[PDB]
């Protein structure tokens, strides 16, 4: 549809007729997408739109089955979806949250960490895990546990499977917090395997070149790596003088031995410096390739989405001593500035972008 | 005591760590208290239990005491009014900044932003301690200072927020208060300062203001900080305001010379003096005294003649809890150096 | 590409001291240079910095501390006026180089300055 010798942008077919104001994502791996207003959520496989009327949802796993919707303090959680044609259609779970709706907190961001749960976050900062079976394989909606006790989570994403149920998930906040926790949705306690602030060294790696880095730098998101120890991590600082911002990708390698890390990697990108102005817009990382668990590829790509473009750059996938001995190179595809990107979602070889009128943008790394 | 061609600094008490007091000169007493008592003497007497404000007498008298959300006033201070406020104690809100503006009243700000008109005469000159007024509909008041007296009551007040906003407010015991002026002077120091200094963008913050000889006009101290270079400035705006329009322009723009580091304690606040009110005016510091003169009458032989710009250095260990002043110097309160005065000979 | 530091040693309250610092190696100009120290029982601070985009230093040494450094090699110099015992400590030399966002530190092994 649009290529060159490195990628690949198809705009594909998919068209949700709604309307003014959109959220929505699609997960591959359970391979529907979903895109809610304030009235309706549509679901959809990836392979017509089936309507839950009534706010923040999320898909869960199962052939088809399983929507969670957040309004307000309330969490909502239908263990089949595929159990209804219907107009009401009520057999729900739900749970009141400790959410004060009445403080102008919302839910933000929120991850399907099964078969541990779903971890949320809120405007506000407060973490929680629910689970939603109860140790008998039966549905539930209970509160797990809080992992919190002008900062906000940035990021959240799993980890290997520790087993049965028990599985790691990574929280990051915009202050440099990073956490690996262990959640289980068997009788057990959550426990924290990695709790550091990375803020420091990566204002220390850029501080000397960049002396702006101090009261500028913030952390957007976090992406783990082939190896369990490593994480990537975006960040930005601003240089007011020149009214420009340059943003960071960040290798750190981490300890859990010793509850420590070591910054392996620091790359400023050259094809974008805007800023975000759009405070509703959080730009994300991408790596296809770390779906595939039988990754045999030298370079990895990542990709990362900015409210109007998708940077692409390669790195190498081991971080060894031949890491920076072979220069990559890096390529954005600039979209119109008209684009509203509302989610997003991947499987093993591409990235899906949804607009609020162009589709969804599909965008695939030959490689 | 230490004295040059310019100016004299004078020495001129027990402790306890928080402390928190000042000096008036026009009631002619200083006050200084810590958690426990307030000691008031003219320029001492004890009174247990923060922050407190002598009032005036109806010789001696008066003295207000802020504790959470209760205000307790003492008509004499050697048989109370009590007011309760709607500051919200248990969400860490604490009163910041307050002001003596008799016979109108008195003025408070908080950490949180709300400005509170209160009386203490209730139409009878009868002592009362009554809710005026609020006039505020990561931003705070840095100054609250006393404009004219207008007449038999009523008095001017000026309010300048960290953001930039400045209100001139009528205020009186006996009403509805009337907003005089009310502009927003950021984005005009901003645009006076962003070509030669473009890092004043996401820095410029305004500390103090204090009025001139003029009515119309006020003097304003700002900075804005270099991150490249970690370097802090410091600015006096000098700007003329227009009741009629609710304008203003930039009269004049001025960065210190000889002070140029950052304000580390976030508890301490700067501030403007002058004390004529050549106009000298005097800058205090955490740990410094700058002294400037400029032109009185804001014409065009106002930059015609170039001006000194000196500094007294205090040692780094001085702790200012608060200052005053009368009309030939200024006063600066340590916790364990005494209260120096720093008198500029003109 | 190493780093080596001159300078150091032992000085009375109030004297003065030069650190430098002029190793480099294949690659050309680097882009930032700075020198840290780590004070016995602190931790390691920045103390000066110069690049392109501005020269920093520290409160603490502000006015009495001035990092200079030649265009046209890759030295550096210290020159630390009206010194304290506080200012006793390991000094180290940065050097930060940038090549197509690649960015890069390397450091020197540090240098013992005593004020007496």
């Known amino acids: 549809f649009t290529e060159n010798n490195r990628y690949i942008v198809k705009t594909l077919q998919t068209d949700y007729s709604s309307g003014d104001e959109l959220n929505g994502y699609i997960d591959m791996q359970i391979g529907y997408g979903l895109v809610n207003d304030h009235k309706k959520v549509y679901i959809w496989n990836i392979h017509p739109y089936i309507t839950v009327p009534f706010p923040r949802c999320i898909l869960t796993f199962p052939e088809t089955g399983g929507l969670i919707i957040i309004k307000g303090s309330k969490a909502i959680y239908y263990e089949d979806i595929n159990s209804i044609n219907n107009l009401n259609e009520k057999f729900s779970h739900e749970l009141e949250l400790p959410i004060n709706s009445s403080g102008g907190e919302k839910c933000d961001l929120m991850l399907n960490c099964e078969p541990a749960g779903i971890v949320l976050s809120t405007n506000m900062g407060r973490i929680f895990f629910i689970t939603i079976r109860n140790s008998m394989g039966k549905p539930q909606l209970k509160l797990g546990k809080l992992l919190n006790k002008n900062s906000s989570v940035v990021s959240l994403r799993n980890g290997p499977i520790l087993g049965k149920g028990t599985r790691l998930v990574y929280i990051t906040t915009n202050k440099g917090i990073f956490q690996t926790w262990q959640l289980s949705a068997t009788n057990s306690h959550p426990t924290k395997l990695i709790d550091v602030n990375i803020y420091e060294a990566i204002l220390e790696s850029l501080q000397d070149l960049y002396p702006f880095a101090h009261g500028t730098l913030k952390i957007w998101d976090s992406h783990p790596l082939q190896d369990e120890s490593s994480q990537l991590f975006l960040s930005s600082i601003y240089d007011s003088s020149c009214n420009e911002t340059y943003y960071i990708l960040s290798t750190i390698i981490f300890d859990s031995s010793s509850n420590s890390f070591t910054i392996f990697s620091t790359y400023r990108l050259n094809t974008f410096m805007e800023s975000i102005t759009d405070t509703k817009f959080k730009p994300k990382i991408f790596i296809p390739q770390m779906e595939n668990a039988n990754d045999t590829n030298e370079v990895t790509s990542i990709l990362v989405m900015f409210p109007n473009a998708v940077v692409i750059t390669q790195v190498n996938s081991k971080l060894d001593s031949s890491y920076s001995m072979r220069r990559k190179w890096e390529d954005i595809v600039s979209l119109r500035n008209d684009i509203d990107i509302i989610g997003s979602g991947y499987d093993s070889k591409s990235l899906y972008v949804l607009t609020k009128q162009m589709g969804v943008l599909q965008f695939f790394v030959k490689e | 005591f230490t004295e040059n061609n310019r100016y004299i600094v004078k020495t001129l008490y027990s402790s306890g760590d928080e402390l928190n007091g000042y000096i008036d000169m026009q009631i002619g007493y200083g006050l200084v208290n810590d958690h426990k008592k307030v000691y008031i003497w003219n320029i001492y007497i004890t009174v247990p239990f923060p922050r407190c404000i002598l009032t005036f007498p109806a010789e001696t008298g008066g003295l207000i005491i802020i504790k959470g959300s209760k205000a307790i006033y003492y008509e004499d201070i050697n048989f109370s009014h009590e007011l309760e406020l709607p500051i919200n104690s248990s969400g860490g809100e604490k009163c910041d900044l307050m002001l003596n503006c008799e016979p109108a009243g008195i003025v408070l700000s908080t950490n949180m932003g709300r400005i509170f008109f209160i009386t203490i005469r209730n139409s009878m000159g009868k002592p009362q301690l009554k809710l005026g007024k609020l006039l505020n509909k990561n931003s705070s008041v840095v100054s609250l200072r006393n404009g004219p007296i207008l007449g038999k009551g009523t008095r001017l007040v000026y309010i300048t927020t960290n953001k930039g906003i400045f209100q001139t407010w009528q205020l009186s015991a006996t009403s509805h208060p009337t907003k005089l002026i009310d502009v927003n002077i950021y984005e005009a120091i901003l645009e006076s300062l962003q070509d030669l200094y473009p890092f004043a963008h996401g820095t410029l913050k305004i500390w103090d203001s204090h009025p001139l000889q003029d009515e119309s006009s006020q003097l304003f101290l700002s900075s804005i900080y270099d991150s490249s270079c970690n370097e802090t400035y410091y600015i006096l705006s000098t700007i003329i305001f227009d009741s009629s329009s609710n304008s203003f322009t930039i009269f004049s723009t001025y960065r210190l010379n000889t002070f140029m580091e950052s304000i580390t304690d976030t508890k301490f606040k700067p501030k403007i003096f002058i004390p004529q009110m050549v106009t000298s005016i005097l800058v205090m510091f955490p740990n410094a005294v700058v002294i400037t003169q400029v032109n009185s009458k804001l014409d065009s032989s106002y930059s015609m003649r170039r001006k000194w710009e000196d500094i007294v250095s205090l040692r780094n260990d001085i702790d200012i809890i608060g200052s005053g002043y009368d009309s030939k110097s200024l006063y600066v309160l340590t916790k364990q150096m005494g209260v120096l005065q720093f008198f500029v000979k003109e | 590409v190493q780093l080596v530091e001159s300078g150091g040693g032992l000085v009375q309250a109030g004297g003065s001291l030069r650190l430098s610092c002029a190793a480099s190696g294949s690659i050309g100009s680097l882009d930032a240079m700075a020198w840290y120290r780590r004070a016995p029982g602190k931790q390691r601070e920045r103390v000066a910095s110069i690049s392109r985009y501005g020269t920093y230093y520290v409160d603490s040494v502000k006015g009495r501390f001035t990092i200079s450094r030649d265009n046209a090699k890759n030295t550096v110099y210290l020159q630390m006026n009206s010194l304290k015992p506080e200012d006793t400590g390991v000094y180290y030399c940065?050097?930060?180089?940038?090549?197509?966002?690649?960015?890069?530190?390397?450091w020197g092994q540090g240098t013992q300055v005593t004020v007496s």
């Open positions: 940065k050097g930060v180089m940038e090549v197509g966002g690649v960015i890069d530190e390397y």
